[PDB]
Design a protein around this motif. Structure first.
Motif, PDB file in Angstrom:
ATOM      1  N   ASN B   1       0.875  -1.418  -0.287  1.00  0.00           N
ATOM      2  CA  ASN B   1      -0.007   0.021  -0.071  1.00  0.00           C
ATOM      3  C   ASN B   1       0.861   1.269   0.018  1.00  0.00           C
ATOM      4  N   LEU B   2       0.404   2.297  -0.312  1.00  0.00           N
ATOM      5  CA  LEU B   2       0.990   3.646  -0.639  1.00  0.00           C
ATOM      6  C   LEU B   2       0.932   4.549   0.505  1.00  0.00           C
ATOM      7  N   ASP B   3       1.873   5.193   0.943  1.00  0.00           N
ATOM      8  CA  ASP B   3       1.803   6.247   2.008  1.00  0.00           C
ATOM      9  C   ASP B   3       1.351   7.453   1.422  1.00  0.00           C
ATOM     10  N   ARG B   4       0.425   8.093   1.719  1.00  0.00           N
ATOM     11  CA  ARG B   4      -0.284   9.200   1.229  1.00  0.00           C
ATOM     12  C   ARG B   4      -0.371  10.269   1.975  1.00  0.00           C
ATOM     13  N   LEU B 120      -3.827  10.836 -11.181  1.00  0.00           N
ATOM     14  CA  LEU B 120      -3.204  10.132  -9.925  1.00  0.00           C
ATOM     15  C   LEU B 120      -2.515   8.692 -10.588  1.00  0.00           C
ATOM     16  N   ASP B 121      -3.261   8.048 -11.184  1.00  0.00           N
ATOM     17  CA  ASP B 121      -2.632   6.600 -11.663  1.00  0.00           C
ATOM     18  C   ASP B 121      -1.391   6.668 -12.174  1.00  0.00           C
ATOM     19  N   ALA B 122      -1.208   7.687 -13.233  1.00  0.00           N
ATOM     20  CA  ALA B 122      -0.313   7.621 -13.908  1.00  0.00           C
ATOM     21  C   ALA B 122       0.878   8.335 -13.315  1.00  0.00           C
ATOM     22  N   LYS B 127       5.838   7.388 -10.266  1.00  0.00           N
ATOM     23  CA  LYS B 127       6.655   7.397  -9.106  1.00  0.00           C
ATOM     24  C   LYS B 127       7.509   5.887  -8.891  1.00  0.00           C
ATOM     25  N   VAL B 128       6.336   4.842  -8.790  1.00  0.00           N
ATOM     26  CA  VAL B 128       6.634   3.542  -8.360  1.00  0.00           C
ATOM     27  C   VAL B 128       7.990   2.860  -9.322  1.00  0.00           C
ATOM     28  N   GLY B 135       5.883   3.044   0.369  1.00  0.00           N
ATOM     29  CA  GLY B 135       4.924   2.351   0.753  1.00  0.00           C
ATOM     30  C   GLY B 135       4.350   2.376   2.255  1.00  0.00           C
ATOM     31  N   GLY B 136       3.070   2.076   2.420  1.00  0.00           N
ATOM     32  CA  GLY B 136       2.423   2.103   3.816  1.00  0.00           C
ATOM     33  C   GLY B 136       3.036   0.932   4.853  1.00  0.00           C
TER      34      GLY B 136
END
Lengths: 19, 148
Positions: B1-4, B120-122, B127-128, B135-136
């Motif tokens: 999961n991504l840390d927002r 957001l997805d792109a 970034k990824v 990551g979370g």
């Protein structure tokens, strides 16, 4: 102040002129 | 999961979708005089979003940069179009085309929200794949309440 930021400022300038 | 927590793009996309959802919630009772403010608030959150994306692009590879710029350009086209349906609706406040005009405002604003998510997805992919991510469902929840 890229092309997107410039294009957007253009669109926003229109809204502000018609309130 | 991504840390927002530190993620200004994600937060700005959420604010955009919230402004679109406020447009939808107010539209039915709004007089034509009140149409400008609710479309302007959508555009203001788009200005913030594009601002935070711009700040990020020079750290990405040219590949990602070009495709991210494709998503931004589309968003601008989406706003231009919402502005066009707003004006049509104003001009039809006192005609029997008022309801249809407002439906087309909502379609145009909904399309904007959908493409904010796609940006957001792109961004996340860029970034990824550039080892820039940390990551979370909430974004989709807003879109779901809007989809109704």
């Amino acid at each position: 102040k890229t092309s997107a930021a410039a294009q957007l400022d253009e669109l926003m300038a229109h809204l502000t002129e018609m309130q | 999961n991504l840390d927002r927590t530190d993620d200004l793009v994600y937060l700005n996309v959420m604010e955009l979708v919230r402004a679109v959802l406020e447009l939808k919630n107010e539209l039915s009772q709004l007089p034509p005089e009140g149409y400008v403010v609710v479309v302007k608030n959508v555009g203001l959150t788009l200005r913030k979003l594009i601002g935070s994306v711009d700040d990020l692009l020079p750290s990405l590879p040219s590949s990602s940069r070009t495709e991210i710029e494709g998503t931004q350009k589309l968003l601008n086209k989406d706003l231009a179009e919402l502005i066009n349906k707003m004006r049509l609706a104003q001009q039809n406040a006192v005609t029997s085309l008022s309801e249809e005009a407002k439906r087309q405002m909502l379609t145009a604003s909904h399309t904007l929200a959908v493409d904010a998510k796609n940006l957001l997805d792109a961004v996340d992919q860029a970034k990824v794949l550039a080892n820039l991510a940390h990551g979370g469902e909430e974004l989709d929840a807003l879109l779901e309440e809007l989809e109704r």
